Amino acid sequence: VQLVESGGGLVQPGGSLRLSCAASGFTFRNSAMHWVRQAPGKGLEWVSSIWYSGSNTYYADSVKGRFTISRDNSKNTLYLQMNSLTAEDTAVYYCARFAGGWGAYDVWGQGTLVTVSS
Amino acid sequence: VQLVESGGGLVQPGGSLRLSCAASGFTFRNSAMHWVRQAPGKGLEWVSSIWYSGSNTYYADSVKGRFTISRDNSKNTLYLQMNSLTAEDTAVYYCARFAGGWGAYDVWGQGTLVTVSS
Amino acid sequence: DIVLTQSPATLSLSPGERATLSCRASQSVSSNYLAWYQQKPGQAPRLLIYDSSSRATGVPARFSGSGSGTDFTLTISSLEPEDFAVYYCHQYSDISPTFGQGTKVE
Amino acid sequence: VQLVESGGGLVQPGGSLRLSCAASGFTFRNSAMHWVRQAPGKGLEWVSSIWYSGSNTYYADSVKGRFTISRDNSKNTLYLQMNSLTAEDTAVYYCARFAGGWGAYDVWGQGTLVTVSSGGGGSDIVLTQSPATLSLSPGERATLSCRASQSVSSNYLAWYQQKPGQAPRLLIYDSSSRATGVPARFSGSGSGTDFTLTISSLEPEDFAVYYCHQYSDISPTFGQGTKVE
Amino acid sequence: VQLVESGGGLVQPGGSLRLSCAASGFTFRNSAMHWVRQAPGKGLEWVSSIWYSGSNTYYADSVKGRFTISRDNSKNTLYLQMNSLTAEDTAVYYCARFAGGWGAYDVWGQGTLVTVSSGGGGSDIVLTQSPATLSLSPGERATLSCRASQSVSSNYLAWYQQKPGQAPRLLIYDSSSRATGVPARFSGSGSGTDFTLTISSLEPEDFAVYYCHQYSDISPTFGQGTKVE
Amino acid sequence: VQLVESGGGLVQPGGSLRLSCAASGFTFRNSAMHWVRQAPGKGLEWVSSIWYSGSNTYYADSVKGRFTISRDNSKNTLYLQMNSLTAEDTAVYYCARFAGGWGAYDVWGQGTLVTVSSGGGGSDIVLTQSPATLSLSPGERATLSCRASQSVSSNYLAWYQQKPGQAPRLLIYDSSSRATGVPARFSGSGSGTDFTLTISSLEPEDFAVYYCHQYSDISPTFGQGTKVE
Amino acid sequence: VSSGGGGSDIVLTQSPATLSLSPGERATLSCRASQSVSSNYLAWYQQKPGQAPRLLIYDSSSRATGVPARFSGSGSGTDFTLTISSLEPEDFAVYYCHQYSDISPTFGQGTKVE
Amino acid sequence: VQLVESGGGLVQPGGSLRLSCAASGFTFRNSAMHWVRQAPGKGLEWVSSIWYSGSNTYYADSVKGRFTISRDNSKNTLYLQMNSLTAEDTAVYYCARFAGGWGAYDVWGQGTLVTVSSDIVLTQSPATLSLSPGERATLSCRASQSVSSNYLAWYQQKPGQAPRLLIYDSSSRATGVPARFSGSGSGTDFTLTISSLEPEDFAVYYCHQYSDISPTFGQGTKVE
Amino acid sequence: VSDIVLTQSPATLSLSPGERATLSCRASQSVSSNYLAWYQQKPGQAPRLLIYDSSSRATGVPARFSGSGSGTDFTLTISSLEPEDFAVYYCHQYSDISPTFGQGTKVE
Amino acid sequence: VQLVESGGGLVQPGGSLRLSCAASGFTFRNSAMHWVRQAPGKGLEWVSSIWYSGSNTYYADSVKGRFTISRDNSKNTLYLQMNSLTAEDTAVYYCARFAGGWGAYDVWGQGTLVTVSSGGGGSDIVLTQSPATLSLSPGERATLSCRASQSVSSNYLAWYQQKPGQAPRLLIYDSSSRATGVPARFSGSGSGTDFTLTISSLEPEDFAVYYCHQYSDISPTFGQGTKVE
């Protein structure tokens, strides 16, 4: 039961980046998956969430219109497309499985640092 | 490399009986030891198992709460304490060394008949 | 939008002492869907308590959560050296998840 | 006078990555350019160097044969091609202009983190042995501790003895099982996260390094060892 | 019951090497076989695993993508193909039979040393900084030492300041030359094998890690840093 | 000025191996190049020498007829071909430039370990006789002790008497059985790990060396002897 | 099994085998030869654990380049000494003498300064 | 050039002791002689001075009025008379020759220990709590031994004013104390909780055990 | 019931033999005539004079000890540490009526 | 239940001191009372014991004949009279109530320091010999070092040889003067603080302990000796 994250790195303002999260050990097709970020020296902050087909994907106001969350259940993979990046988007980004009443964020990715600077 | 069994016999319903198994020719103190029984004319049936200190002892559902497996490593002896005996406990009881991937039940006791009748 | 406020921001304690951490919500947290996480430097957060009081599998008994409505508490009965970290509370009662700003136990 | 770095991120072991560093404000085409890295919680370590045409490119033994430093002087850009990545390459990588007697590393890129890992957000079972050292005499008792960060299922924990220049030797497995031919003065105990190895009365042949080892999952880990002197 | 290991030796970075381990005395075809390595003066570290042909081979993140474990059950032989070698692979490698609950690593090969290096019999210039830590208050003097294992030609020694999360910043080069924009309270001195960085009156912005750096040859080395708190 | 070595490793007795040494920074074609080795825990020992075309190549006595030194001046490379390897050849091997009156061995390679071994143990039954020497007079009693590291199954332990220049002669077998023709003054006793040979009244012809011998497994071992003088 | 009777080499005997000294003290190491070493072709080497030997002195008394002044060799014929005037922490190692006055180079068995 | 000291020992508070220091190897008649003391785990501290006579003798405020420095040049001996001793005088006392610009304290006596001396330690946690009105304050008092009868009290003290009883007998809220204050615990671990802070509740809080003849207080928690 | 304060830095120094120890003494007011001394104290023993008059090294004190400074900033340097030099070091001003000491720096 | 100690202090060798311990809170007149001491940086050591009337008072062998334990049950006070004091008596002395099977030393006094010294110390020139041991063979060179903490005026340093059971024998005085009848193979050298004794070629009669000795002041001191075996 793990989430294998990939992507990130150093980009310039206005650039683009896609993060990946590959799941194993559970029926990913049924889980709600979230992205959470943490700016350097600051606290945890929810970014986006996605669930079954026919349910609403949600975004934090600070990324609405710039970030796109998606999933490929055939590959057991979660994605976050990050466009129009600015210095405030600099943070460690975590993918996490949301278990609600059965464990909240009970499985986390190891996190990848995204730095936006010129 | 052998297992010397003793005990058994004819007992009344509700009675008690203790079986013994004395090992030689291998490092008994480290071995997983099982009891297996075979009712007259019927097939083999696992009864109980015991292993190293720090492992769980296991019992078949049909003997849980009535039988107690134990070992005395200083004497290289395996025991089965059989309480609350019923006519269904009538069987030939075998001790056996469990080698798992290296030979399953590769060493057997010769078996002793326990008959429960009034 | 439910704001979570943790207090105090910093707790300076010695091994063996008890740490009492507080999370106070601006609104009632439906179903007491509140969780606590432990984060050590350079590592991902780790679930300690969920549903306000449920201790996750593998979490030592010295961690315990309590409270309801708007007042929640995380208690560490006897601090071990590995317990000094930052602790976040987290409400998942609505569609806009929010976190506390953390309490650093040092 | 600037170096604008880009690239990095989280990559699987054996994967590939390319770092870039764009220069401005100086005659880049003539400058000696280096890459320097810094593992998490470690010091600075030189990686590679490139200079004028007519000079050799240089690599550290850590990366020679897998990494390629290059430059495109028409775009004032420095490159580092990172192939066959391994967990030991995890570090923050800096591009830097080398001025030698005129400033050493006087201009640095801001640095980008490269993490090479296949694991999830969970950690392996970490084994901590204590004490690091025990000074005892023949005949005395040695008590060694192994504590796990998580519970070791089935108490699948082993103890090994290693003497200088020799392979490790199995002493205890399954937390308490003494291997064949091991003297009875060795005994193990404990369960879950707290394990102990006891040598009842030390003999002169018992002075060695002792390791604990958990094999309760697919990621085997060892303690860092206790030296008995 | 024996594992006869062979192979290893001294090889160039990026080179290739194959290790072999020939078994006797047990049913090799059924046994899970592992490789374990031990860096010089370090602890045991698991490398790879192989089992029956209905299971998956496993690798540590340190070697995954470069090493290949394999077996030929008709010759009772275990193999480790080591490609794209790096100085981080330098260690004694052990083959070992894994018995799980029936003996953990109960049989070990004797081990073979693999050293990955391109250097000669001489050592790089080693810089030792002291003290490791200095706890001071604003207004006080900080005196930092850098001692080299060999004389630093031309006094080509530099000092850097690094704050958390930031790239290093040049303070002093050529042992005593203060870089552009550096306050006069920073000053370096010394020659040959003894160098000093002095901060005359500490300010709160001076609390950081400080590194010395020698660039007097083709193999650049850094000190391990002094943290000023 | 450097010598970059490569090769070595772990091989079985009777095997073959070739070491290499690539030079740079000096006129290799005119240099006298040697090989020097050092067994673990022992000192330095010269092995072989090669020089200009028109000079003799030299070898240590022990390696003559087994090792071959050679050079390829076009590639600035020195070689050592090692054949008929035995355990006595286990050593770290160094290439070195010989400067004579201008520096002796002034340049060394970093060395590569060569280990010749058919196994890793070691786990034989070790017999320890005591005392090593017994000075006694005729008519006195000699009590000789033989202690085994593990239990000798079936008490399969024999005692032999050997006089200078003669083959050993069976005295006792099965721990206590006197061989036919052995005088009654000899007697063996003991079991498990503790065995004794007793000569009740020493005759002048009884002064010799006495060995114990366990034959309880496939690896027969002897004690190192007790000299009754 | 033998490739020749001897074995008629120059034997170097170092003394003492072990020296237990504190930093700041002087280490006086002796190397005696069974025969006279022609041209005083005798060298000294320092070897630390896991490292290649390092030339200190050659021609009995000449310091190699980079060798500090606290190392000094002397002697002639059959009696040679190496002296480390003020021991630094980095000076504790094993020291070997070496004669190269013939076609059969020989070493001493070393002196461990600890 | 010696200074041979003698005296000291263990005495009850308010008692008396005399220290002496016998000099040899120098012209004691002309030398400035000082006394210096060092409390356990503390620094060096000057005590007294004597000179030619000429004798403006000097004392530190810690000892002036109770100690007497004197000298008898005919016996090359320095004296220090210690009267009305208190636990805070416990220290190692050194005699020393003062050479000023030609050696400062260049000769020291060996020093002698003077100890004036003869329970239950309370440890409060945390030392500091920074909170806002409406928030929760949780205070801990950890005793080195079990407090019999749960005889533990809590007091609040605002700056410049006397302490005020909040809780006694571990759980009893004092008369006039608002219900937002609450105590609990037994044996060695006690807790004071202020459920929702008011701006007047920011003060220092002390725990107090009165279960024996030697009453002790915690070292206080500052709530700011 | 009822001067010049000396502050030493750092409070603690962890070093190895052969390394340099640099000690600081900072006075709240100028020390007239540079009447400042340094003492070495080993556990359980009386203090030992190292340097006085800010820079004057006492008789029998090894040359590896050296003092410097004037006015309000004084420094003691131990150039190459030996294991017997690990002790607590005090600075001391004797330029007035009320002599004062620093609180000491532990060199371990 | 309390024990109030008083007394102690700094005394000269051969002097006298009395310690007292006043008890309260228990039936003192019935209790066995002991004295226990602890030398600086050392462990606890029992000194004396006293009990009811009709029982023997007991002393440790070091103090038997010098110390007297007594008690006055009318004042609930325990006393220890300490005569013939020597620097080995320097310790913290504790009174303690002995409860045996009902609490051992369950009540302790606070302890008082007794220091017995004549004014040390000191100005003595410390001589350090190195090495402590030299293992050599006949015919080899022995080089012995003597280092002084301060300069030895006039080079008044001597060397003595001592064989087991015999008085020391003068070898060298005035640093370099070989005494009459001493073989020329002995020679001394050095000045100031650095002195050396050289035995050019050891003879079998030269294996002994060697001491250096400075007589340049009123407090003569010896080195601790170098054994040549």
Is the distance from CB of D114 to CB of D88 less than 8 angstroms? no
Cβ of E34 within 8 Å of Cβ of D169? The answer is no
Give the best residue of C92, C99, C101 to mutate against chain A (max A CB count within 10 A).
C92
Give the count of Cβ contacts less than 8 A between chain G and I: 8
Q: What is the rounded CA–CA span in Å between residue H171 and residue H167?
A: 6
Is the distance from CB of J61 to CB of J149 less than 8 angstroms? no
Is the distance from CB of J147 to CB of J128 less than 8 angstroms? yes
Cis previous bond, E131, omega within 30: yes
Per-residue exposure over J68-104, b if at least 16 CB sit within 10 Å of its own CB, e if not: bbebeeeebbbbbebeebeeebbbbbbbbbbeeeeee
SS3 category, G13: strand
Cβ of H140 within 8 Å of Cβ of C14? The answer is no
SS3 category, E8: coil
CA D20 to chain centre: 25
Is the distance from CB of G52 to CB of F106 less than 8 angstroms? no
Q: How many Å is the maximal CA-CA distance in chain G?
A: 49
Cβ of D181 within 8 Å of Cβ of F123? The answer is yes
Cβ of E30 within 8 Å of Cβ of B101? The answer is yes
Is the distance from CB of J204 to CB of J140 less than 8 angstroms? no
Are residues E43 and E25 located together in one domain of the fold?
A: yes
Neighbours of chain J (3+ CB pairs under 8 A): G, H, I
Is the distance from CB of B100 to CB of E101 less than 8 angstroms? yes
Is the distance from CB of F223 to CB of F128 less than 8 angstroms? yes
- The residue out of D81, D98, D121 marking a domain boundary is D121
Q: What is the rounded CA–CA span in Å between residue D146 and residue D162?
A: 16
Residue J89 phi, psi dihedral angles, 5° rounding: -80, -5
Residue G1: inside a domain? no
Cβ of J137 within 8 Å of Cβ of G15? The answer is yes
Closest CA to A77 of A65, A87, A86, A69: A69
CA I23 to chain centre: 7
Note down the domain range covering F64: 1-121
Q: What is the rounded CA–CA span in Å between residue J210 and residue J220?
A: 17
The amino acid occupying position C89 is: C
Which member of G50, G52, G90 has the closest CB to residue E121? G52
- Chain I residue with minimum CA distance to J148: I60
Token pair listed for A48 = 């986006």
The β-bridge partners of F114 are F9, F91
Q: What is the rounded CA–CA span in Å between residue A99 and residue A90?
A: 27
H contacts of J10 (beta carbons < 8 Å): 5-8, 110, 112
Which member of D40, D121, D150 has the closest CB to residue C58? D150
F contacts of D167 (beta carbons < 8 Å): 120
Are residues D35 and D115 located together in one domain of the fold?
A: yes
Torsion of CA F188, F190, F194, F198, to 10 degrees: -30
Closest CA to A89 of A21, A35, A51: A35
Residue G66 burial by CB count (10 A; 0-12/13-18/19+): exposed, middle or buried?
A: exposed
Cβ of B54 within 8 Å of Cβ of D178? The answer is no
SS3 category, F209: strand
Are residues J78 and J148 located together in one domain of the fold?
A: no
Residue D65 phi, psi dihedral angles, 5° rounding: 105, -15
Closest CA to F48 of F33, F27, F29: F33
The β-bridge partners of E186 are E199
J contacts of G79 (beta carbons < 8 Å): 141
Q: Confirm or reject contact between E54 and chain B (CB < 8 A).
A: no
Is the distance from CB of J116 to CB of J87 less than 8 angstroms? yes
Cβ of F120 within 8 Å of Cβ of D165? The answer is no
Q: How many of the other CB atoms lie within 10 Å of CB of C49?
A: 26
Is the distance from CB of B33 to CB of B97 less than 8 angstroms? yes
Are residues D174 and D83 located together in one domain of the fold?
A: no
Cβ of F6 within 8 Å of Cβ of E9? The answer is yes
* Distances in whole angstroms, Cα of residue C97 to Cα of each of A109, B65, C24, E74: 18, 49, 15, 59
- Chain H residue with minimum CA distance to I61: H106
Which member of A7, A12, A107 has the closest CB to residue D9? A7
Name the minimum distance, in Å, from the CA of C15 to any CA of chain A: 25
Are residues D179 and D128 located together in one domain of the fold?
A: yes
- The residue out of J121, J144, J163 marking a domain boundary is J121
Q: What is the rounded CA–CA span in Å between residue J179 and residue J78?
A: 60
Q: What is the rounded CA–CA span in Å between residue J62 and residue J87?
A: 13
SS3 category, C83: helix
D contacts of A117 (beta carbons < 8 Å): 110
Cis previous bond, F138, omega within 30: no
Token pair listed for H12 = 């009850």
The amino acid occupying position A10 is: L
Are residues E139 and E111 located together in one domain of the fold?
A: no
Note down the domain range covering B12: 1-118
CA angle J56, J60, J62 (to 5 degrees): 140
Closest CA to D35 of D56, D63, D15: D63
SS3 category, J126: coil
Torsion of CA F148, F153, F154, F157, to 10 degrees: -30
**G85 Cβ neighbours under 8 A, 6+ residues apart:** G26, G70, G72
Is the distance from CB of I49 to CB of I58 less than 8 angstroms? yes
Q: Are strands E177-178 and E186-191 parallel, antiparallel or unpaired?
A: unpaired
Residue G108: inside a domain? yes
- Chain I residue with minimum CA distance to H101: I53
CA F137 to chain centre: 35
Cβ of G15 within 8 Å of Cβ of J130? The answer is no
Q: What is the rounded CA–CA span in Å between residue E220 and residue E125?
A: 8
The β-bridge partners of E189 are E196
How many distinct structural domains can be found in chain I?
A: 1
J100 DSSP assignment = G
Closest CA to D48 of D95, D86, D6, D3: D95
Token pair listed for H181 = 């204050």
Are residues D167 and D226 located together in one domain of the fold?
A: yes
Cβ of E101 within 8 Å of Cβ of B100? The answer is yes
Cβ of H126 within 8 Å of Cβ of C18? The answer is no
CA B74 to chain centre: 18
D204 DSSP assignment = G
Are residues D159 and D221 located together in one domain of the fold?
A: yes
SS3 category, A102: helix
Token pair listed for E205 = 């912005």
Resolution (A): 2.0
G/J touch flag: 3 or more CB pairs below 8 Å = yes
Q: What is the rounded CA–CA span in Å between residue E12 and residue H140?
A: 62
Q: Confirm or reject contact between E53 and chain B (CB < 8 A).
A: no
In the sheet that holds I73-78, the strands lie side by side as I6-9, I21-27, I73-78, I65-70
Q: What is the rounded CA–CA span in Å between residue E39 and residue D19?
A: 29
Give the best residue of G21, G22, G26 to mutate against chain J (max J CB count within 10 A).
G26
F contacts of D181 (beta carbons < 8 Å): 123, 150
CA angle G63, G66, G72 (to 5 degrees): 30
Q: What is the rounded CA–CA span in Å between residue D43 and residue D35?
A: 14
How many distinct structural domains can be found in chain B?
A: 1
Q: What is the rounded CA–CA span in Å between residue B95 and residue B111?
A: 7
Are residues J89 and J139 located together in one domain of the fold?
A: no
Are residues F63 and F134 located together in one domain of the fold?
A: no
3-class SS letters over D18-49: EEEEEEECCCHHHCEEEEEEECCCCCEEEEEE
Per-residue exposure over E75-96, b if at least 16 CB sit within 10 Å of its own CB, e if not: ebbbbbebbbbbbbbbbbbbbb
Are residues J38 and J149 located together in one domain of the fold?
A: no
Q: What is the rounded CA–CA span in Å between residue I19 and residue I9?
A: 17
A52 DSSP assignment = S
Is the distance from CB of F100 to CB of G100 less than 8 angstroms? yes
Are residues D141 and D190 located together in one domain of the fold?
A: yes
Which member of D165, D167, D181 has the closest CB to residue F150? D181
Torsion of CA G94, G97, G98, G101, to 10 degrees: 170
Method used to obtain the model:
X-ray
Specify the CATH number for the domain of residue G73. 2.60.40.10
Specify the CATH number for the domain of residue A90. 2.60.40.10
Closest CA to E89 of D160, D46, D89, D224: D89
- The residue out of J68, J94, J121 marking a domain boundary is J121
Q: What is the rounded CA–CA span in Å between residue J92 and residue F47?
A: 66
